[PDB]
Design a protein around this nucleic acid. Sequence first.
RNA 1: GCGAGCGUAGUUCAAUGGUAAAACAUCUCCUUGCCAAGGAGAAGAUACGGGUUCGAUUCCCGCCGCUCGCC
Length: 983
Amino acid sequence: SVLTFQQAIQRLQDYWASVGCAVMQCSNTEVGAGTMNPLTFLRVLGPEPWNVAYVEPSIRPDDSRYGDNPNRLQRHTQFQVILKPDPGNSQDLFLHSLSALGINVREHDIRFVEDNWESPVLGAWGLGWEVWMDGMEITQFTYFQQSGSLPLLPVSVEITYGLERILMSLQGVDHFKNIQYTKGITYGELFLENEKEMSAYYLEHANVDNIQKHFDDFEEEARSLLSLWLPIPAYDHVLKASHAFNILDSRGFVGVTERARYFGRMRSLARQCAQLWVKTRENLGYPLGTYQEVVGQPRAFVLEIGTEELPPHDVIEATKQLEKSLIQILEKRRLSHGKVRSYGTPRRLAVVVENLNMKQMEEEIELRGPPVAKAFDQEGRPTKAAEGFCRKNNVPIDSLYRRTDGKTEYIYARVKESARFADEVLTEDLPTIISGISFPKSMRWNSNIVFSRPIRWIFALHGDLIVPFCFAGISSGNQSCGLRNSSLANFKVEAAELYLHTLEKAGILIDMQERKQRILHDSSILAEGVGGDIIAPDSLVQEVINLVEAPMPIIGRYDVSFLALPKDVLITVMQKHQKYFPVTSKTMGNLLPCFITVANGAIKEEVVRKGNEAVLRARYEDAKFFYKMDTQKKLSEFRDQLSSILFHERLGTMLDKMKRVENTVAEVALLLGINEKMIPAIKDAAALAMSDLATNIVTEFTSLAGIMARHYALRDGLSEQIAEALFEITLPRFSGDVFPKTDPGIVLAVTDRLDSLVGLFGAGCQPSSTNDPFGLRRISYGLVQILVENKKNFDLTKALTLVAEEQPITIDSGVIDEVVQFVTRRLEQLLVDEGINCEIVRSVLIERANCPYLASQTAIEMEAFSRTEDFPKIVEAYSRPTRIIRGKEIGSALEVDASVFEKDEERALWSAYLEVADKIHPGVDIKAFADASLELLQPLEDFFTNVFVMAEDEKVRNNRLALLTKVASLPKGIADLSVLPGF
RNA sequence: GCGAGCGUAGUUCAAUGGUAAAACAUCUCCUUGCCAAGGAGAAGAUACGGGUUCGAUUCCCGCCGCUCGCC
């Protein structure tokens, strides 16, 4: 029959005992996971080999739900296996485990989807995958690299089965209380009331001060026993203190600001138990050993680097910096070739260079060295440089001559190219090619070489002969693994020109652009067989392509009564978590009860559809309960939960922040010049803002912040524009998203971004680093795009003098004069990379930098004027009276008068100044300026020609100074003309 | 938190294994004087430290600053 719950264990722990793991027992203290058991956190540190495997429950109380939802339990059993050192087969033993416990691995769909692991409390992290059998995540698989705070050597492999998410799939059961434990008895009929009334304890009746005391008591005892040098009890007390913190957090007694203190209090206990254990081991001497460690026509050249499953976006950025790094070094070494072409797959990165040469080019080239001054001399030609110049080239020293190299120097000679057979060249240069590829996250598995996933085979051939070398303990050869668990899981390719034809004879489609066209072209037949078509945003196809090797699509049905949910929760479940394709009927274009999934390989396609249909019958069944729990109360009541989300420590939660916005959004609608008959209809849509952030859905689907506020608002019976404005307080959410277009949608999206700037700035967290906490870059970058894309006239130095007045911490006039600069630099960077010149955007941003729309308007309109032949007339016309007045003690400020203006050309210059200054007002555009100064430039050169400005008289020489101070100051407000070149 | 790319006169930019160039700015000499303009001349730099090589601005390592993605 089927596997019961105890046979699963009785077979897993004897299979893993045939391999060689010791089989221990669980602990006797409450833990939350398995990786914190005393014998997998302590005993991975050191040189000590530790193959072990055990079974333990895990108790985490904040997941207690009275035992009703069929997936979450407050006490669930695991199965943990740790292998140190990494044996090498570490994921071909796993798939023998699976078919050992009665699974048919040639029939289901086993997928290795990447998921890293990190935990700051223990101070550990590692890289690895999670295993999807028919859509269900069943197992985690990790290589460790830190533990405590000291790096690991050698690294450990951790495999952690979860034995109640496996047994519901292997048995056709939807609710855990129907799982057959042994022949006759059920799982519910053993653990139901423990599930039911330990929840009431961890959830309602836990005495919450006799735990607050026990936390500190355990902390003190573990800190004391770390001074008699006793690691064992000094860690058990850490275990039973981090337990008592969990049933504090569950009861809700931990506020919002104590968590950052509790985590710190308990992290430095595990951080310093580790350094004691690793030493008390080595004072014994490590009683468990120690870990120490030809000429012919051209032929093709193929190089493949097998791997274990890379992420979906480490194939794309590593199939480029390999082909480029090969293109360079093929010609750096004087070798000729043809059509070079790369490829990719989750577990191989191939490159093909066609008809590669057989020898180097072998031509003689000139080469000039040091000048005749340094090396050559009269009767002293060889000093110390000529010999060094001929030694590295071994040409005889009397084979040199001179050339007019600028100054008729630099003696030189010829050299040779030294043909080297094109297969002893690559031996020297390939390892530094393969070692060149660099990723953001990277591993170590058996040495100090770094890569993103372990390399398992290298297939590098040329013609018929093998290019021999070694990288990371693997000697290159001519074998390759095909589609896993098939008849061609290992083949050998003879000649490098029948590589591709052999590869696709084992099922693999390696050409990346011909997997997209066999996904999106066998999905359409399915979607049209039912009546509709797919929804494939090309940010999802680029991540479904690189999860598969030989694709195969399948349609599946889910229930119709789930169609009452919002459309944008159905599609987000089906896309961002399971990676499916929704289906919409192309007549009346809303959703249908179908989905399309992409299997991988030789699949039964009768069990995988039936297995996938029953996972999003469960995720939908949870989201529907959340939704029905969220329509129990009117939306205006979800505000008063907001006071339990942290924003920043010394300034507080989110409820106070949204409190500080209703009181200022009544003026930012006057700075932008918004119509009067909408300043009412904004403010009531300002109290409801950011309310959905405490909802039940949005805590689960944290990407629906903003959608599931408009959905509730419209349903409650508000206006349309209120609900629509309740959505664009979040736009834009990343780089390249739509901006707020409606009128009351700008006010709020601007008023929020003013606060999150002025508060975070005037309260310590300044971005002065390469480190970016709190995202102060994009928050400051979006505030200028909401304006330059929307034709709005703003004042950055008045709004920041008014949205800083509200904060709880005091804001002095000096700290808002750096926010303006941190915004202006961002505007300059936005403006330069639009194909603008760099010198004009620094001559408009000196006084037009306040209103970010007029600046971006008048900096594009100034370059086109700079390229016309009036720029050199104006930039000089205004430079003749600003240099001549570099300081001569002009004291009588205005002085522009006819008191004594007995000058000849003054009487015709001041008139021109008045008739132009009557046009140029402090906000004029650049063209009226550029046509109003061209007629002023002549009386200038008719004034300077005659009048001797400098003082031949004592008092009356200030007219002649003010009359030019004015003509010099006219462009104050339009452009700072003393920076542009050509002055 | 991690990666990626960068750093040359005062501002912008060429070059590369072995006399670091040019533009604008600055200075002096000219005089239908003080501004501008046309002419001659002069001075001025590889962020910093370390490594090989006879010689590194260039190849290698380490420190400081800047810009950009993810967290």
